[PDB]
Amino acid sequence: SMNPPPPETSNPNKPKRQTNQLQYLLRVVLKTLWKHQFAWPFQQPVDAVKLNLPDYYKIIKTPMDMGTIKKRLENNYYWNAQECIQDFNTMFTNCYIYNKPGDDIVLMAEALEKLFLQKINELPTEE
Ligand SMILES: Nc1cc(O)c(C(=O)O)cc1/N=N/c1ccc(S(=O)(=O)Nc2ccccn2)cc1
């Protein structure tokens, strides 16, 4: 098996804007999750060669990871905070799709997802 190229993280032609939500998504949400004890499997694209997962990209057609999300936020790749929230949810659900209920890695994603939901609950929407 061979990996796909990572998701795009930079497009010089896309319009750029900074919002309080995007700022919070990067400075608080991504930062908090990145430092979580369970973060390390999700900090870069799944390397199915290095991890000996030859069917991963046969099953996962929309890969996503927090290293990509970090780059997207940093490059002003997102226009809407919802695009970022969706990438986080793609990352969590990818793990659920590839693995099985009760798997350790699925419990780890579930814990990260709970933390994620607690943090976006406090998203600044002009407070
Ligand atoms: N499954 C994985 C698949 C992967 O692809 C990668 C990766 O690519 O990096 C890492 C993975 N890691 N898998 C772990 C499984 C258990 C533990 S654990 O020692 O903390 N034990 C428990 C037990 C129950 C609940 C929580 N943790 C740590 C990591």
Side-chain angles (χ1 to χ4, degrees):
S1 315
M2 58 187 291
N3 298 310
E8 179 175 55
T9 52
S10 187
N11 191 331
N13 295 318
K14 298 178 79 154
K16 284 176 159 55
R17 74 170 183 176
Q18 74 170 260
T19 71
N20 292 325
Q21 296 190 342
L22 291 171
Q23 208 72 21
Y24 178 83
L25 281 176
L26 174 61
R27 290 269 190 160
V28 172
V29 175
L30 182 287
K31 186 169 181 179
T32 297
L33 293 196
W34 192 275
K35 303 158 99 175
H36 189 279
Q37 68 184 338
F38 292 157
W40 62 272
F42 306 99
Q43 282 174 350
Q44 59 289 310
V46 171
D47 187 328
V49 173
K50 204 168 301 191
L51 295 174
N52 198 23
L53 299 180
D55 55 351
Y56 185 83
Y57 286 112
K58 294 190 173 197
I59 291 153
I60 297 304
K61 298 302 181 186
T62 309
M64 184 54 55
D65 64 278
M66 290 199 301
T68 297
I69 294 164
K70 183 181 177 287
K71 284 176 182 171
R72 285 182 167 196
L73 289 168
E74 289 165 339
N75 300 336
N76 299 277
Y77 183 88
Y78 298 125
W79 184 263
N80 296 329
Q82 187 65 27
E83 297 174 274
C84 176
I85 296 162
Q86 184 154 20
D87 282 352
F88 271 108
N89 277 319
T90 295
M91 177 182 85
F92 295 133
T93 55
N94 281 350
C95 181
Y96 308 150
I97 293 169
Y98 183 70
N99 297 287
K100 301 300 179 299
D103 282 354
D104 280 348
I105 188 64
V106 169
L107 299 173
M108 294 161 62
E110 292 182 347
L112 283 170
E113 183 183 21
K114 293 312 112 188
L115 182 52
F116 171 75
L117 293 169
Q118 288 167 353
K119 300 311 283 202
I120 59 162
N121 180 50
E122 307 196 310
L123 203 54
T125 178
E126 313 310 319
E127 75 300 325

